[PDB]
Write a protein that binds this ligand. Sequence first.
Ligand SMILES: C[C@@H](O)[C@H]1C(=O)N2C(C(=O)O)=C(S[C@@H]3CN[C@H](C(=O)N(C)C)C3)[C@H](C)[C@H]12
Ligand code: NA
Ligand code: NA
Ligand code: NA
Ligand code: NA
Ligand code: NA
Ligand code: NA
Ligand code: NA
Length: 270
Amino acid sequence: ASQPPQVTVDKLKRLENDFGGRIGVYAIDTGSNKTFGYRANERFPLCASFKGFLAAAVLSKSQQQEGLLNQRIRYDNRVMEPHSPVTEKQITTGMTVAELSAATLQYSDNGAANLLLEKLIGGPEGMTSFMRSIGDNVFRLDRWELELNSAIPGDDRDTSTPKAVAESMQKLAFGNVLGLTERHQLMDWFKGNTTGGARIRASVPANWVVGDKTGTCGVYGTANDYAVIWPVAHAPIVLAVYTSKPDRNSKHSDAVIADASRIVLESFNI
Ligand SMILES: C[C@@H](O)[C@H]1C(=O)N2C(C(=O)O)=C(S[C@@H]3CN[C@H](C(=O)N(C)C)C3)[C@H](C)[C@H]12
Ligand code: NA
Ligand code: NA
Ligand code: NA
Ligand code: NA
Ligand code: NA
Ligand code: NA
Ligand code: NA
């Protein structure tokens, strides 16, 4: 009952040619275990999309350290990175670990990302080792915000693949690597993301529920989104959509990500 894979490939290749870049995807029907990929094992820059996994790493650490989420972090006289919309307002109050995690995921807050990487997760190396610990042998985070966003073609630093991103999202959302409380909290955070309205969310009927995390490097036409999608009375779908363009000075396209997502989701004939 699903569409032939080549039909879906054919559609994505036409979309790619109109876009003038590369589109990589991977999707998993968590109920049938049917999958679809296109450029699924090619590396793409993560950009901010790692922050959803950073929030998961924090939750995994809290599952072993009672009360970690409520711990208050203060950062008086810290130089805050560009795009710190939540953390720049909370210097006087500080923020809890839960609030930092929610901010980094839902607002892409860089101050929050680097605070959590410095104080809780152990830097890019620690982020990568969390992903290794869940069986993701592909992901790599090498640099801190914002240097990780350079998106240079051929540079494998700060990259993953659509398949690895989708597989890791599936494990975290639905597998055994996080406890029930932690899963539920992670899903709530993804559902409340604020930066994805023009991407995967724009590809689905408005009564479907979506949790997602975006990435927008700001160079080389490079942008992405990954998500859990809950269609009406169907098993959730996990989807990753990554894009890049060869020229440094091109812009990314939200619409191309939404259109790619629609093509892939339609292929499951839900
Ligand atoms: C500087 C890097 O950290 C960038 C990165 O990646 N982030 C994202 C994103 O997560 O999409 C964005 S998209 C930006 C966030 N706020 C805007 C937004 O939410 N909307 C809905 C337009 C656009 C930044 C450019 C940031
Ligand atoms: Na058709
Ligand atoms: Na990269
Ligand atoms: Na917890
Ligand atoms: Na928050
Ligand atoms: Na940069
Ligand atoms: Na490239
Ligand atoms: Na476009």
